[PDB]
Amino acid sequence: MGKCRGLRTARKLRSHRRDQKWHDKQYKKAHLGTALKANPFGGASHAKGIVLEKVGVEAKQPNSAIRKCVRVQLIKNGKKITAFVPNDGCLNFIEENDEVLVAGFGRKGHAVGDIPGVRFKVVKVANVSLLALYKGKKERPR
Amino acid sequence: KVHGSLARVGKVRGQTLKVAKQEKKKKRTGRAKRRMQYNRRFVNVVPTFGKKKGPNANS
Amino acid sequence: WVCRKTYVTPRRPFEKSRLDQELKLIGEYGLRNKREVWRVKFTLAKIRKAARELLTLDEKDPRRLFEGNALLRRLVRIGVLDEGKMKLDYILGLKIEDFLERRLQTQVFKLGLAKSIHHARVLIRQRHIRVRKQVVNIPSFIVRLDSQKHIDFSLRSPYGGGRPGRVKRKNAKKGQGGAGAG
Amino acid sequence: DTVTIRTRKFMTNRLLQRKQMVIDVLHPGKATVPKTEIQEKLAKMYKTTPDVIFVFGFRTHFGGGKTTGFGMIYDSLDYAKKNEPKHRLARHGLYEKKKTSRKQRKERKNRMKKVRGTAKANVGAG
RNA sequence: UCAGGGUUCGAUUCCGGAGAGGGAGCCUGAGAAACGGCUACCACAUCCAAGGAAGGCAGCAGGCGCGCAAAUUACCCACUCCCGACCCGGGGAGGUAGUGACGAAAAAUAACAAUACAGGACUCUUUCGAGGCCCUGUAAUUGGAAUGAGUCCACUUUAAAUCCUUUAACGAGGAUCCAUUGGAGGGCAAGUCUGGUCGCAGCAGCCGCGGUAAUUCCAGCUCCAAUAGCGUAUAUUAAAGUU
């Protein structure tokens, strides 16, 4: 309680709630829209780009590994993202200065696992999925 | 060895044994797949004292 | 134009206790899939939702009388409920198994020739039974109470009168053209 | 095979000069007999001869053993020939309409817009 | 979507409104500030003998471009209605087919005996042991029976046809007329089996696995879940009495 409970206090309630909703964390990203503007995506699930150069990222402690990322610039916003390559040895199935299709990690703007600075992964290298390259259901077209 | 192109991919898949042993069998589907699942778990009659043994085990 | 989704999924994805009940229920009636179970259980919970309305509102209001009467009539017409009951409270005493009993494949087995429940489903689909005069391929019929004594084989089919199948009629010609002289 | 034509919804339609009913058929052999065969039998059930019988419909129920259609019986030929949908007269021939169709018509029209005072010229051009 | 109270979404088949590249003006008519009418500017773009002339797909198809992202330059006025001087003409409105795992409904991928082992109620017997019944899988073959999937004459369907339903003749022995998608340390239903790798390579929404005996990696085997579907990304609700 600690609040008015008149029968004519609809205004003082409905204007108060509309204000104290802005302090909520979820709401403040959704409704200012600065989230979208800042994102390298337009708010689309995927996006398409062109590879710039392979890189390797050294994982945050205590784990030690090299995580074989790429760096890609996008078509639809012309700006750059550092993107993970999943499975094993799929670095080889990516070849520089071609198109790729990117996709978010699965934690909505926040780095996943022990790798820092990488919020994206890669799905298609030339209309052929990393899954099908790895399994052998399709082959890289050269 | 920790080393041996330890800055580069392929080191646990390109140097394993290659196995391609497989069976020939016809597995059941739909109705019959549930029929075997029902009988094999619950009615044979199943019970044996103090059993705890799971549906798999290497015991 | 108009569509709806009949089944619903379980709230929890895994729970040994729940899974065992769904398994043993499928074993009993020889059902194909768990989607064929949740479908039934939707029907029950639907009827239970409608019922829970009518119990709150005084008797001798027109909504409660007319609805209840015609609801209970339908429950009696399929015979999952007695007329020695027929009160709205006894709607809530209904449960899953009574529905599944009224299914065609259950009634084929119960009142006609089969060797197991697994046999009976195959007979319905391979068109060797009828319901009064009419072939069916649906073992999920639900069978009105009056009609549980008109389940018969098909009037043309190898079971009952009608032409011999192509396993028989092959082998009959195997005594004259399959091994008769060539 | 076994052919049973059974009479249902008898109406004497004086305004169109016909008699319209339902054509209820039972046949446990091969269900669905030719429509030609049906109108022979119905001709000799009201004695009106098969040049004023018209039938259509004939969807066969699941499991066979029954088929149901819809049939008319006209008093005279000229009353049928006048009333009758065009395709139903051409169904068992005594009528036709030549149709080119529907691209030859439009392409002629659009060419005709360009000329004036002569309608026959564009048609002559082939 | 949801117990009650709510929250989010509504470009999109009904109804109302606004607009035909952007602006402005206007003729005709009962009705228009009309654009498959006209006149001008501005922005575009085409033909030309260079003197001039002509244009507006947010109509149906189709193409380019844009992007994560979206179908046939098909048939036809038979239905439904509309328009006309009119029973008779016309209508990419509209109806029909094609492409179509958006999504929804239906439910095939083997059912039954023989032998073979196996279990337990039951009976006889002092126990031992035997008989015998109910069912189970599981091997070996089989045996008889059944059916559409397909192929396919015929009827039927309809504007004409397809499909469907209806019907000949062919059409099943498990090897083929082949079910996959994910996972098996905990959350959370399922292996401390074997080989390889040995903080390397990789896995891991989260907690964490990997440094020579890896229940988590790479494979095989086995098992579990869901099942003609299942996984992944993002928006959004419930979970949130964390508005």
Side-chain angles (χ1 to χ4, degrees), chain A residues 30-45:
Chain A
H31 278 56
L32 222 185
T34 306
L36 300 180
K37 301 168 194 173
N39 287 349
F41 292 175
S45 53

Side-chain angles (χ1 to χ4, degrees), chain D residues 29-35 56-64 82 86-87 91 97 99 101-103 105-106 109:
Chain D
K30 178 259 180 64
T32 313
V33 292
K35 296 190 295 182
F56 54 96
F58 301 118
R59 280 178 171 76
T60 302
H61 301 81
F62 197 82
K82 181 179 182 296
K86 53 185 73 176
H87 57 276
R91 193 66 64 105
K97 183 64 175 296
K99 297 189 168 187
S101 196
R102 208 181 175 274
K103 284 288 189 174
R105 296 180 181 173
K106 294 182 178 179
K109 183 171 64 181

Side-chain angles (χ1 to χ4, degrees), chain D residues 53 70 72 74-75 108:
Chain D
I53 309 294
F70 197 101
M72 299 181 183
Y74 280 80
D75 297 299
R108 203 183 80 155

Side-chain angles (χ1 to χ4, degrees), chain A residues 9-25:
Chain A
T9 49
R11 181 169 283 113
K12 186 60 175 181
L13 289 167
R14 197 181 68 95
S15 57
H16 189 259
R17 179 55 61 240
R18 189 172 59 181
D19 189 53
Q20 297 297 293
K21 191 156 59 176
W22 285 94
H23 296 297
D24 189 61
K25 195 176 183 66

Side-chain angles (χ1 to χ4, degrees), chain C residues 103-122:
Chain C
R103 292 172 55 91
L104 191 57
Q105 63 181 6
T106 311
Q107 293 293 97
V108 171
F109 182 70
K110 199 94 297 301
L111 304 171
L113 297 181
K115 293 269 72 177
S116 299
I117 58 184
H118 302 290
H119 188 192
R121 188 180 179 97
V122 183

Side-chain angles (χ1 to χ4, degrees), chain B residues 1-13 15-37 39-41 43-45 53-59:
Chain B
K1 294 180 173 181
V2 63
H3 59 286
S5 303
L6 71 170
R8 216 78 278 157
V9 307
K11 199 174 179 292
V12 74
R13 186 166 174 268
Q15 47 182 39
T16 51
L17 66 167
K18 282 74 173 178
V19 190
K21 182 264 178 294
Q22 298 298 137
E23 295 79 64
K24 294 187 70 177
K25 189 60 177 180
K26 186 188 190 309
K27 303 297 184 178
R28 289 296 184 86
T29 49
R31 181 176 64 259
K33 197 169 185 65
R34 295 298 185 188
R35 182 181 179 168
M36 290 182 171
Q37 193 176 309
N39 283 270
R40 191 171 293 116
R41 291 180 65 183
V43 283
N44 302 99
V45 293
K53 58 196 296 182
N56 196 9
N58 301 290
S59 302

Side-chain angles (χ1 to χ4, degrees), chain D residues 1-42:
Chain D
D1 297 305
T2 301
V3 177
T4 303
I5 306 296
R6 184 55 158 151
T7 57
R8 185 176 180 204
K9 304 179 183 296
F10 204 107
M11 196 267 283
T12 45
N13 187 3
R14 301 177 65 174
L15 304 177
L16 296 178
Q17 299 76 236
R18 64 193 194 196
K19 299 181 294 183
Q20 51 186 78
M21 56 201 291
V22 177
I23 307 300
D24 299 283
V25 183
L26 299 170
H27 32 202
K30 178 259 180 64
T32 313
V33 292
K35 296 190 295 182
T36 51
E37 175 57 60
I38 297 173
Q39 59 181 348
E40 301 308 298
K41 193 161 178 178
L42 186 56

